[PDB]
DNA sequence: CTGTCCTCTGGCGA
DNA sequence: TCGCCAGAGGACAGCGAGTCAGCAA
RNA sequence: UGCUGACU
């Protein structure tokens, strides 16, 4: 009979230090806890009141024995004050800004009042009373803030319970750190001129007072509580009514026994670490009570007393944070260290307890029980216990358990009684457990421990879990003489599992009430599709693939004996009679088809009263594949009419198509997945089963597959070209490099090599990445043309026979990369996109000559796997495979810290009744979940291209699903108006974007106006001669009520999911799936016209179809997506060019938000007219940066009188591209470079211990230590300088300085821009399209070309430049256009459902806030916030606010041990009465 | 595993007569699946399968030296001509029947001999059961160790991807009555887990810090929650509780 | 002094006999360092073209 | 590799030592192989494999064992737990409570020691 | 009166995980079981015989609820 | 290692 | 003449799961 | 409790 009572909210606060007193049992005084055998010490740490540490004994406080003792708390008494280390850095600001001589806060009053009213109005929740208090106080001073702040505290109250919610933290904790941070400096006092008796600590346990004294913790407790009397009504509120008294300690608290217990460390048999900080606490404190005598018999002895304070200090710092104090040694980890880590005691204890009834073991594959069974070995069976209650309908089967025994298998290991418990039977006598079988239905009945009783639901995890799909439900088949759990392979590729050593781990539900959620929610058919982009999981593999794609091939015909044996070996069938099908040949030979084989199995397994499915689609094997001869041309025949690539299922009878990959597979669309939307999951795990079973039984039976040699192996007459091909290859480095180093086209052969060693011994290195890259490319097409010639039709045996072809090419298992590289080629080996490094020396490998042209040298590998590869190319290979050895390592961390990041904070939002994502704070990050409702699983038939499907299969997915009978329930009149409206406005307005309005309405008098009335005024007020007439007809000339240019003018309908409600209102749908079924219904009623099949389905009974598949796609409340969109943004990334990609970019947009990223962009279109293709070349001329350092050929310095001659670069090579001129780069010297010289030198000088004549004479007129420079009349032909500073200065080498600095020295540059770039084509459909890429960020600097190129259309991967440009909401889009550009590099491809989730929970306050520790700091649960990271500085945080939480996240509902508020508890039962 | 790094897991032990024979008489003793060569690309296991069958039958020895055989002289001529001189095809095909159907397959099968190493990693020594034992005393969980019963780790990934499902009710039971679960009670007005305490023996516990003793309500609460709260009231920090 | 070494753990280790090619193997090993297994970049795990002869490109633990 | 670790056994008091029982010599295998004569100490055995796809239990990394083979000795093995007593532990510096031995007619040892407080060679332990 | 009519499936399971658990502390069944052990298959029996007199409160994110009958909800 | 966060930190016209 | 735009370094805190063993302090 | 190995 449990407790019965739950938690409503925890908040953090502090003790009092007074009510601890009470809270403890005795003082401990004696420092040796240890007693000499073993045994607790009287009055040490160890006692027997404050608890029995072990079951040995019983406390003296309550007698009671371990296991049923709460334990005690006891006190350390100090000998004289100390500071508390974690309330101790606050105390020092409090003494940093305040007049140790006035006791008041140097702030000044203004601040000290507006951020008390801030509070004040904060602490109910009023949030716009911040800004407004601020405003009233500026324009304004206690009298004027408190009458308005009053006013909102009595108006808006009622609002204390709904004040903590994110956007009301955040506006406190940014209020109370600014404080902190910007008024609490040491400041000169205002009332007393002289009031700065500066502290300032030294490390902690030390703090210092000037006339430089010693702080004691008595002095600056009298301080502190002197400054509470005259500041106190406003740090009451800064710190909750918190008392001075807090911030020092007077003893120290020994937690209870239990929890601190004895284990062992080096040459010591019984010691705690927490016991050994508190016991050298103890001896200081003896040391000290010793001293404190000595002054009491009576500048040593006092020193003596200040070093032994700043001692006990540390250990009671170190007591608190073992790192607080680094100056000692012994020094076991404190509390931060318990609390805060990985191994911490929330991230383990807390978030990842032990569990109990569970297995692990090695998974090993089965295939003979059903797709959502487990085979359990008879040994967990035996051992795995449920705990079922005994009633009348089960006291029998119960009764043969209790008989059976602990040890036989359908038994039972105890018995639980109705008051009394545990009883066990393991005896072994056979008769005791006969004495009991009685007595079972003899309060709470007994319960018998029964065994696994090959029924029972497990759940199943393999531990990288990095989806919901790795933990399923399965259905325990007992499975006798075995150690190994057995699963079936198409659960395979939902937990990664690999038959190679595979531990997984079975947990047993023991509640009835997570049975029903295993079978209804976990089960393993609910999770036939994957969630991040519904496209299907569960599917066959392998061998299962080549013996369905060779069965269901055309030329496969079996006798009546092999047709039966086959479909009944498949089936296995249990119920009803096999319905078979007819003879295809029923002449020369009664014959089958097996495409017979596969229909008749598919006509049993569909359920009886269903109607079986018709299907339209293509094979994964391309209809070319079996094209051997060359294909000749027939006049009316479209190949593809009649092809084994195009599958045809009617009426459950397979017509046409191999049936490969593309179904039976993880591939959408297929016949599976129609068979699971159709007919359920249930369903589809049949099929997948008695398919699975089928194509064993014909591999087995009368078939074979093998992969031998002869496979693998390649025609001669076509290793021959693959020989000279190679040959050819071997004479292709010398001109490749040759011809990207830009080199005279020939004659230079040694000129080359040095060229090369040069750009490889170079600093910049991006000359020598252009030869790597350059050499590459000639390589790669070596390499393509060597695969052409052998692996298409240069095989022994082609695709129907070749047994590597036919497993590759129907999916079963690798890829067409691995064929090849097997036969004809291995590749270019690349380690980081590069060619392998070379040596110090200039040679890639002992065995090649420095700077080798050849390719072999770099790592073409021109040997294959059919004939190994020699010494080298096996070298290569090694450091390649290693690389990815190493890689695949390091990823794993990364992706991983990012899952947590991403599911820490997204954990709470679920969808809830009225279908918006929430978060736990009731927060609203979304209206509908996806911008539709829709859940991304139950949408993948929603998409146009198959309502061609559910059309055909109307008859099933209307019977089996829908029914006709919700459509007789559902009413679309509200919705249907809506639409109609919709449409006529869009009718009447074709441009939305055309500016609507009344008066804007009221300009077609234009020529009324323009052609006599205004032709006399001026621009009286600025607006016009002509627009005063307009405005005087209008204003009050026009009708009083029925001047409705309104109407003409007004907003579209808004959208129906908006107003009606896309659950309870029928034909409520989006106005982007209405668009695509008025198109199909468009499409459909004229192909009915010309169909020859009769069609009994009207287009108004498809557009009800298509509604109610709609409504019921509607993400069920209390969906938890933020999970969900957490882990589809992580799996991916775990698993898996001038920009950035990989975990770098997904960790810049999410985890960092930057302001800063390594690679900004932009790409604004061109505007398409030749005026503006003219200016761009201009414009990409005037954007790049010009550098003194990239126009200037060498300087020339003598040296105290130190000259400095430029000699720059002839226009020739400079200003084709540039947009540069003489004068001006001159003109750059004369006022910039040689005046950030003397700026220089005196940096370095700081701490060292006709017309010629105007510009020469300004120049000297601002400095004082140039002479006279040059002049150059053609073409800067000598321009030098000359300086000196005579008496004494460091005469060296300046040259460093005046080329450091002619190297950041930029003539001129658009701030933020460095290259402008025109990829001239980025489209096909309307090829016509440029783009100005840039890589750089100046948004403004690009606003002035409107003309020239297209701003509509500017794009930036900044996300913080665009959302200080256009807002927030453009950023959205921005951040998900990143992240889907981020994943479609890989082609991965996640739903835009679970973005938009992000985007708006990132962006959710007005800012692109990151998803990271940061971040939290706005989080309205102080228990959240500290199981993520910086668990101390949270809870510090927490406790010195007195933030409470409601225990409405997942993390503090599984804290204080609650039920999270999402998916099943989301609502009561309420049995009535 | 054999020397080319292709482990795995022994599944069956297929009885003798259900195996296909030869029609040699002779019946395999490994049945390899031939879907490990397409991606792992070990090339190296069929060379070593002709070689070995070749030795078997001449009574020879091969050497399998890397970088002995060129492209020129291949390994798979060398060895396929070895075989075709003693009666046996080229290719290291020779066709089976079925032990089950006794039919001639349609493919002829690829038979050999290799040397096949047995690794140190038996279910025998990986293997884990556990229904109630021993607990960690300062969190009163179940202990960690496969030597000892110990009890396996259910993690924050886990206990992610469990509600992901929606089921809070399998998440209760993993979490919180399976690992720890116990009745410390508070009291309701002070809302403290603290304050508490028993008497000397009627036994009513009796708030410290107000002396009522109709004030206190058992609350069902994880044992690391309690631990929590006494290490934090160790560092003065008070947690106090709102029962309902 | 930590005798000019840079790592002060790992130095000896249990030659186990369980295979002769498991013990043959403690003979012919050698470590970078015991520290380098905490490391964010790895670029001493590079396999450079200069341990030609001198370390096996293939022996090397795999995790 | 459970193959054969040493030719010493009676001597080593290891803790754990597999051993396989009737370990064969490639008949495919590197010269070098024979130039640090590793026959001395053999690690496997040569096995008929068929490449084939028949069972429908060899999938994804599983094998196939017939299972005459098996019960013919096939990769048979063993392993050696050597357990040392030293009984100096249960104890302190007082009095020898260490000395293996038999109180005479212990219920308890009754047939399962050999008056020396040790199991007989050659015992089943369970 | 405004959410959806129809029962979520995750209130079918806690519906039926709670009958269940009732059933199996000796609660009368109104369903005339046939011979089934499991209290789940019975549990299911009931819900398919629309006869479970559970009352759904469906909370909403501001604490208010409604209240709606498991006979007056759209199985599907 | 890398990032933000944090804490200063002296330097020209108002 | 020092406040705020700029400007510097210093400090901290994070670094994927979950398993099995031995040896030793 | 830590260091060494090891598994996916
Ligand atoms: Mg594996
Ligand atoms: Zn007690
Ligand atoms: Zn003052
Ligand atoms: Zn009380």
Redesign the interface.
């Known amino acids: 009979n449990m407790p019965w009572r739950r938690l409503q909210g925890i908040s953090f606060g502090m003790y009092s230090a007074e009510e601890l007193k009470k809270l403890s049992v005795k003082s401990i005084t004696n420092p040796r806890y240890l007693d000499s055998l073993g045994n607790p010490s009287a009055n040490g740490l160890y006692d027997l009141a404050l608890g029995p540490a072990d079951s040995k004994e019983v406390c003296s406080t309550c007698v009671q024995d371990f296991s049923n003792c709460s334990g005690h708390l006891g006190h350390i008494e100090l000998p004289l004050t100390v500071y508390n280390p974690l309330l101790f850095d606050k105390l020092y600001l409090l003494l940093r800004g305040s007049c140790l001589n006035c006791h008041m806060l140097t702030c000044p009053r203004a601040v000290i009042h507006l951020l008390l009213c801030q509070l004040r109005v904060l602490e109910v929740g009023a949030l716009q009373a911040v800004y407004e208090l601020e405003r009233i106080l500026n324009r304004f001073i206690r009298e004027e803030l408190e009458q308005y702040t009053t006013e909102i505290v009595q108006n808006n109250l009622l609002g204390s319970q709904g004040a903590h919610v994110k956007n009301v933290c955040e506006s406190k904790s940014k209020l109370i750190a600014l404080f902190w941070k910007a008024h609490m400096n040491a400041k000169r006092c205002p009332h007393c001129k002289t009031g700065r008796s500066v502290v300032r600590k030294e490390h902690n346990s030390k703090l210092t007072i000037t006339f430089r004294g010693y702080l004691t913790p008595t002095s600056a407790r009298e301080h502190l509580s002197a400054l509470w009397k005259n500041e106190g009504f406003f740090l009451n509120y800064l710190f909750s009514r918190f008392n001075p008294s807090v911030f020092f300690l007077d003893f120290l608290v020994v937690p209870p026994s239990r929890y601190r217990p004895v284990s062992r460390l080096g040459d010591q048999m019984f010691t705690n670490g927490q016991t050994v900080n508190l016991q050298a606490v103890m001896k200081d404190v003896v040391l000290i009570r010793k001293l404190l005598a000595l002054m009491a018999q009576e500048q040593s002895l006092i020193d003596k007393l200040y070093n032994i304070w700043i001692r006990l200090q540390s250990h009671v710092n170190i007591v608190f944070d073992s790192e607080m104090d680094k100056l000692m040694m012994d020094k076991y980890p404190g509390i931060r260290q318990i609390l805060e880590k990985k191994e911490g005691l929330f991230r383990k204890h807390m978030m990842g307890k032990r569990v109990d009834y569970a297995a692990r073991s090695v998974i090993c594959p089965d295939m003979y029980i059903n797709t959502n069974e487990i085979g359990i070995p008879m040994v967990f069976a035996t051992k795995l216990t449920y705990p079922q209650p005994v009633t009348p309908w089960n006291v029998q089967e119960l009764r043969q358990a209790v008989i059976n025994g602990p040890n036989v298998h359908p038994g039972a290991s105890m018995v639980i009684n109705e008051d009394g418990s545990r009883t066990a039977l393991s005896a072994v006598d056979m008769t005791q457990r006969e004495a009991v079988a009685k007595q079972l239905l003899t309060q709470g009945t007994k319960i018998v421990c029964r065994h696994v009783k090959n029924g029972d639901i497990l759940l199943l995890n393999r531990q990288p879990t990095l989806h919901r799909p790795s933990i399923q439900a399965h259905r325990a088949r007992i499975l006798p003489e075995e150690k190994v759990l057995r699963l079936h392979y198409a659960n395979c590729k939902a937990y990664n599992a690999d038959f190679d050593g595979d531990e997984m781990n079975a947990h047993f539900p023991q509640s009835e009430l997570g049975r029903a959620e295993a079978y209804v929610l976990a089960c393993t058919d609910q999770q036939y599709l994957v969630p991040k982009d519904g496209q299907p999981l569960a599917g066959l593999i392998q061998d299962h693939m080549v013996s369905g794609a060779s069965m269901t091939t055309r030329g496969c015909f079996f006798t009546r004996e092999h047709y039966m044996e086959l479909v009944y070996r498949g089936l296995t069938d249990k119920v009803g009679r096999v319905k078979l099908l007819s003879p295809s040949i029923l002449k020369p030979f009664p014959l089958w088809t097996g495409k017979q084989v596969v229909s008749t199995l598919l006509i049993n397994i569909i359920p009886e009263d269903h109607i079986p499915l018709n299907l339209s689609g293509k094979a994964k094997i391309t209809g070319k594949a079996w094209v051997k001869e060359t294909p000749r041309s027939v006049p009316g025949f479209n190949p593809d009419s009649m092809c084994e690539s195009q599958v045809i299922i009617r009426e459950g009878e397979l017509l046409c198509g191999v049936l490969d990959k593309a179904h039976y597979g993880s591939s959408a669309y297929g016949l599976v997945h129609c068979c699971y939307e159709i007919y359920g999951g249930e369903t589809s795990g049949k099929v997948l089963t008695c398919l699975a079973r089928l194509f064993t039984a014909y591999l087995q039976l009368y078939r074979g597959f093998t992969l031998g040699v002869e496979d693998i192996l390649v025609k001669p007459k076509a290793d021959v070209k693959r020989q000279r091909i190679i040959e050819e290859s071997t004479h292709c480095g010398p001109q490749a490099v040759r011809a990207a180093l830009n080199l005279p086209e020939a004659a230079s052969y040694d000129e080359v090599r040095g060229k090369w060693q040069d750009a490889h011994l170079g600093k910049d290195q991006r000359d020598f990445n252009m030869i790597d890259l350059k050499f590459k490319e000639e390589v790669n097409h070596y390499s393509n043309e060597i695969n052409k010639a052998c692996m298409p039709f240069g095989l022994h045996r082609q695709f129907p026979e070749n047994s590597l072809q036919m497993m590759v090419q129907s999916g079963a298992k690798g890829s067409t990369v691995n064929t090849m590289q097997i036969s004809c080629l291995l590749g270019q080996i690349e380690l980081e996109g590069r060619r392998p490094p070379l040596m110090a020396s200039g040679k890639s490998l002992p065995c090649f000559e420095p700077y080798e042209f050849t390719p072999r040298a770099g790592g073409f590998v021109t040997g294959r796997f059919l004939t190994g590869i020699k010494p080298p190319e096996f070298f290569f290979h090694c450091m390649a495979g290693r690389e990815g050895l190493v890689d695949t390592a390091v990823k794993t961390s990364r992706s991983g810290y990012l899952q947590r990041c991403i599911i820490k904070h997204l954990e709470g939002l679920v969808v809830q009744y009225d279908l918006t994502v929430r978060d736990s704070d009731g927060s609203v990050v979304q209206f509908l979940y996806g911008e539709d409702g829709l859940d991304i699983p139950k949408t993948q038939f929603l998409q146009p291209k198959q309502f061609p499907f559910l059309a055909s299969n109307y008859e099933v997915i209307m019977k089996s699903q829908h029914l006709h009978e919700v459509l007789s329930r559902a009413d679309p009149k509200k919705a249907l108006h809506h639409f109609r409206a919709i449409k006529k406005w869009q009718s009447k307005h074709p441009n939305t974007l055309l500016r609507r309005g009344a008066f804007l309405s009221y300009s077609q008098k234009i020529q009324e106006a323009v052609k006599a009335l205004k032709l006399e005024s001026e621009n009286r007020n600025g607006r016009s001669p002509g627009t005063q007439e307009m405005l005087r007809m209008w204003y009050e000339l026009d009708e009083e009520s029925r001047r409705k240019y309104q109407k003409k003018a007004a907003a579209c309908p808004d959208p129906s999911l908006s107003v009606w409600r896309p659950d309870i209102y029928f034909a409520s749908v989006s106005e982007t799936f209405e668009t695509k079924v008025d198109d199909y219904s468009q499409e459909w009623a004229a192909q009915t016209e010309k169909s020859y099949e009769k069609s009994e389905l009207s287009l108004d009974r498809l557009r009800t179809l298509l509604q109610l598949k709609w409504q019921r796609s509607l993400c069920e409340p209390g969906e938890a997506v933020g999970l969900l969109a957490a882990q589809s943004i992580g799996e991916p990334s775990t698993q898996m060019m001038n920009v950035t990609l990989g975990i770098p970019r997904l960790r810049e947009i999410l985890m960092v938000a930057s302001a800063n990223i390594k690679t900004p962009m932009m790409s604004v279109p061109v505007l398409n007219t030749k005026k503006a293709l003219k200016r761009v070349k201009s414009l990409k001329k005037q954007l790049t940066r010009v550098c003194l350092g990239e126009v200037l050929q060498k300087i020339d310095v003598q040296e105290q009188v130190y000259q400095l001659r430029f000699q720059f670069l002839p226009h020739a090579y400079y200003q084709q591209e540039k947009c540069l001129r003489p004068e001006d780069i001159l003109r750059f010297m004369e006022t910039r470079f040689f005046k950030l010289l003397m700026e220089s030198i005196k940096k370095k000088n700081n701490k060292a211990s006709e017309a010629m004549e105007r510009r020469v004479q300004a120049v000297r007129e601002i400095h004082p230590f140039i002479d006279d420079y040059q002049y150059d009349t053609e073409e800067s032909l000598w321009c030098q300088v000359t300086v000196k500073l005579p008496l004494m200065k460091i005469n060296f080498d300046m040259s460093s300085l005046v080329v450091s600095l002619a190297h950041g020295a930029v003539i001129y540059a658009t701030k933020g821009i460095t290259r402008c770039l025109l990829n001239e084509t980025t489209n096909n459909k309307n090829e016509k399209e440029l783009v100005l890429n840039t890589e750089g960020i100046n948004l403004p600097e690009l606003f002035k070309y409107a003309e020239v190129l297209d701003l509509r259309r500017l794009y930036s991967n900044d996300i913080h430049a665009i959302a200080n440009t256009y807002g927030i909401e453009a950023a959205l889009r921005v951040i998900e256009k990143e992240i889907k550009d981020v994943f479609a590099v890989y082609g991965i491809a996640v739903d835009p459902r679970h973005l938009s989730l992000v985007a708006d929970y990132m962006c959710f306050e007005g800012v692109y806030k990151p998803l990271n520790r940061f971040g939290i700091r706005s989080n309205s649960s102080p228990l959240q916030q500290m199981t993520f990271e910086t668990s101390f500085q949270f809870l510090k945080q927490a406790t010195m606010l007195g933030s409470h939480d409601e225990l409405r996240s997942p993390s503090a509902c599984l804290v204080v041990g609650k039920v999270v508020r999402g998916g099943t508890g989301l609502f009561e039962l309420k049995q009535p009465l | 595993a054999s020397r080319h790094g292709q482990k795995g897991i022994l599944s069956r032990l297929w009885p003798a007569e259900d195996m296909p024979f030869t029609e040699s008489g002779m019946v395999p003793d490994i049945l390899f699946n031939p879907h490990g060569f397409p991606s792992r690309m070990t090339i190296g296991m069929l060379i070593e399968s002709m070689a070995g069958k070749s030795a078997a039958l001449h009574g020879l020895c091969h050497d399998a030296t890397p970088f002995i055989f060129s492209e020129e002289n291949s390994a798979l001529e060398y060895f396929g001509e070895m075989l075709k001189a003693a009666g046996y095809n080229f290719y290291g095909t020779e066709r089976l029947y079925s032990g089950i159907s006794g039919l001639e397959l349609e493919a002829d099968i690829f038979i050999g001999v290799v040397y096949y190493q047995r690794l140190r990693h038996m279910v025998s020594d990986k293997f884990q059961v556990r229904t109630t034992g021993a607990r960690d005393r300062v969190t009163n969980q179940p202990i960690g160790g496969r030597n000892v019963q110990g009890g396996i780790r259910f993690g924050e990934m886990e206990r992610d991807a469990l509600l992901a499902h929606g089921t809070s009710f399998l998440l209760h039971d993993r979490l919180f009555n399976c690992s720890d679960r116990s009745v410390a009670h508070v009291c309701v007005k002070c809302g403290s887990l603290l304050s508490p305490l028993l008497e000397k023996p009627n036994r009513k516990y009796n708030c410290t810090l107000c002396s009522r003793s109709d004030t206190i309500d058992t609350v069902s609460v994880p044992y690391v929650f309690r631990y929590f709260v006494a290490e934090l009231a160790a560092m003065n920090i008070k947690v106090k509780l709102d029962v309902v | 002094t930590g005798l000019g070494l840079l790592q002060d753990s790992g130095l000896c280790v249990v030659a186990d006999k369980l295979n002769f090619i498991r013990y043959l193997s403690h003979f012919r090993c050698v470590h970078r360092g015991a520290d380098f297994a905490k490391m964010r970049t790895t670029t001493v795990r590079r396999l450079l073209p200069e341990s030609w002869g001198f370390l096996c490109p293939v022996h090397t633990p795999d995790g | 590799?459970?193959?054969?670790?040493?030719l010493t056994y009676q001597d080593r008091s290891?803790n754990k030592?597999?051993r396989?029982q009737t370990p064969?010599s490639?008949?495919?295998?590197?010269?070098?192989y024979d130039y640090?004569d590793?026959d001395?100490?053999p690690?496997?055995?040569?096995?008929?494999?068929?490449?084939?796809?028949?069972?429908?239990?060899?999938?994804?990394?599983?094998?196939?064992?017939?299972?005459?083979?098996?019960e013919r000795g096939?990769?048979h093995?063993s392993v050696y737990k050597s357990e040392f007593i030293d009984l100096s532990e249960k104890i302190k510096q007082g009095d020898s409570s260490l000395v293996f031995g038999i109180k005479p007619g212990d219920p308890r040892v009754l047939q399962k020691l050999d008056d020396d407080g040790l199991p007989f060679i050659g015992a089943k332990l369970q | 009166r405004i959410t959806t009519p129809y029962m979520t499936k995750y209130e079918r399971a806690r519906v039926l995980g709670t009958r269940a658990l009732q059933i199996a502390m000796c609660a009368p069944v109104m369903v005339e079981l046939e011979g089934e052990t499991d209290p789940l298959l019975i549990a299911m029996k009931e819900l398919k015989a629309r006869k479970i007199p559970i009352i759904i409160r469906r909370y909403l994110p501001d604490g208010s609820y409604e209240d709606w009958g498991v006979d007056e909800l759209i199985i599907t």
């Open positions: 590799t459970m193959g054969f670790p040493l290891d030592l597999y396989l064969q490639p008949l495919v295998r590197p010269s070098m640090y590793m001395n100490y690690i496997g055995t040569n096995a008929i494999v068929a490449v084939i796809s028949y069972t429908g239990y060899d999938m994804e990394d599983a094998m196939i064992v017939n299972k005459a083979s098996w096939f990769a093995g």
